[PDB]
């Protein structure tokens, strides 16, 4: 177990895939995890249950990370239960791949609001809530697409490129008060194209999850404004 001065963590879009592993990983290292879900209570509750059965601390929380007012409410709820919030992971993300010539503005906004605006709101709240205690760490989960572009993903790459850039700006603003901001850019993660990956396999959600954890942990305390690639050598 990595070392955490903080006690709890909010993970957006934590119901499944990468968000679910981040919750597992961080729970296994002694943090109380808050598992944000948007729609399905049963999946999120089953995850919470699974973690409790292993002796870890976990809770579920319903909101839409793209909604300003839902995100503010959800933080107020956490501060009320736990006394504060030390850690945050902006993971909420959707895709809507189309060739640009076919893509409508609505398709572009849809991904921008759900991926970038959501991270802006989360990061803003983190700064509000973590400044009081002069301690925090935030990780934005982004993608290789945000660094290198992709055919059919003008909107995804825009939202991830934006997230990466934005996170650095936050890093500047949280720095004096020891609130760190960093990004992670997964490559191809399980859940053909393996040939272009030097490690010659897909990454697990776990491998991403453990890099997020490092960046939240005290081990990375002189690290802020960095992007950590977790892509098997696909992009260097």
């Amino acid at each position: 177990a990595m070392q955490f001065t903080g006690k709890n963590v909010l993970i957006t879009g934590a119901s499944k895939g990468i968000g679910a592993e981040i919750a597992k990983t961080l729970a296994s290292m002694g943090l109380k995890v808050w598992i944000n879900y948007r729609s399905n209570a049963e999946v999120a509750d089953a995850l919470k249950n699974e973690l409790e059965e292993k002796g870890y601390k976990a809770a579920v929380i319903k909101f839409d990370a793209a909604s300003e007012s839902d995100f503010i409410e959800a933080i107020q709820t956490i501060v009320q239960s736990d006394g504060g919030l030390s850690y945050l992971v902006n993971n909420a993300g959707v895709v809507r791949d189309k060739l640009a010539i076919k893509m409508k503005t609505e398709d572009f906004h849809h991904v921008i609001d759900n991926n970038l605006t959501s991270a802006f709101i989360g990061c803003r709240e983190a700064l509000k809530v973590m400044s009081k205690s002069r301690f925090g760490s935030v990780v934005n989960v982004a993608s290789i697409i945000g660094e290198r572009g992709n055919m059919g993903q003008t909107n995804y790459s825009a939202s991830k490129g934006g997230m990466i850039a934005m996170s650095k700006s936050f890093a500047y603003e949280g720095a004096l008060r020891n609130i760190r901001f960093n990004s992670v850019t997964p490559g191809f993660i399980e859940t053909d194209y393996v040939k272009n990956i030097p490690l010659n396999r897909l990454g697990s959600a776990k491998e991403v999850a453990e890099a997020v954890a490092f960046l939240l942990s005290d081990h990375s305390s002189y690290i802020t404004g960095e992007t950590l690639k977790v892509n098997g050598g696909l992009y260097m």
Copy 2:
């Protein structure tokens, strides 16, 4: 510089950097289309200035953030000129504030005006330049700047994705990232850049001289980054 193409649309071309891009490109033989959003007088004075020097220039009102306006404007150009070879996404605003003071509206305002606008422009470029299997497109960039850095980081990333999508049809996409441009201690060249210095880098990236260059970001900042 050499241009296979014949004309260019520049968004936010009334003044500052956009205006210099128009001058520069007009003096190198391209017919420039000068998009303005609000002030007709400044745009028409620019058009006039360029005409009086024997260059070819036109003016066009539309809001680059508006999908339907951008599509109409291109239709207008295609109708006058037969097509469009070059495009410069320059439309851009700032609204600096510390993130804790910043409202969602402040964030969207910059996103829609800077990033969404470049998306639309790029999309239309692709539609209109594919037919003729030729084009070049330049996306111009612009503590307290979470919204600006988001929109510009996004633009840079998005442009690369466009570069992928235009590549087979020889439609290049590239970015320029100006530093402090005239409207110093941390700038190695120890001076502000002129709008002209930005404008000539745009021109290179549109010119045939940069024909093996796509998906790139060109910094024009005096060594500041």
Copy 3:
């Protein structure tokens, strides 16, 4: 304690500063540390002793990392004592800042040989020795006014490490880099975190990149500079 599938680690220039902390940190997480020194046996022995007195596993080993033949001999020695080598840290490094117009070729080579060539040799040997067992991780510890030679050697190291990452990838030998900033107030003013880093903070990022935790990470550079770049 972070998770290590591997058992031992060689650290070049481990006598003092950052190299010494990498040794302490990794020793405390259960790895047998090999403490390379070039000249002073006493300081290196005192470190080894300190770590053994705490119940950790540690050894010292004399060689010049810039020397091809010395480095090969030393690895042979390790393989022979421990059965193999799972981890390596190229930390051997010098500076010789001067303005380029005053800098001689000898000044440039001096830094290149001691920083870049040394890392090449270490990385090459890592690949030879780790390929048999299809497991390993390697960390290279890496512009500016007055530092044409340093930036050259560090830019090179960073680029070279990626090439290594390609070559070790099929055999699950990962290569990564770390780029410390100012490590222990007018220097501090340009650092967003507004303080110097400790050797520990660098040492723990190295450890992560060696640990199983970073197993899908290769060819990456990890900045440990407090937001300075």
Copy 4:
């Protein structure tokens, strides 16, 4: 393109990319100095070709890896032309090997020929251009230097080093308006398994690289220093 400066030295200018840089720059009115190491005939044939078209050109023998040879050669140019406004460090060799097969001598061979050579050139450019408070210098590197490569631990090292080093030079020349920049070519026509990963779906010409070098030297890029310009057809973004 517009050049305030009047002449240019290009290292390894006999052939390939270096030759095209010379042709390009000659056709835009610069007096070009064509460095060669070994073969006089090829360099002379290039000079001849350019003179027959009414351009200004000279040949100059030296090894860019040798400090003393490079100093002499600049002294020669200053003596003929009054100064030197532009420089292109292009001298470069390859010696690909898998690292486990590579000897230290193989590593140095590329470092000395590619990186040390650029360091010397850049150093001299600074000495010779400072007096007149004007200059531009381009280090021709490679995509390999940005992304690394299987079998090119020594090439990448030397190009990664170049790109980093050039920025340091940019800092040191900035007050005196001496700009330093790099170019990183991708796969350039070498005399369809390479081509499939290139979005533009073709190899670049030596010309397309040559014209990017020219831009970076030209007055058109006067607010650009410490930058790396990729000329790789989208292969790396």
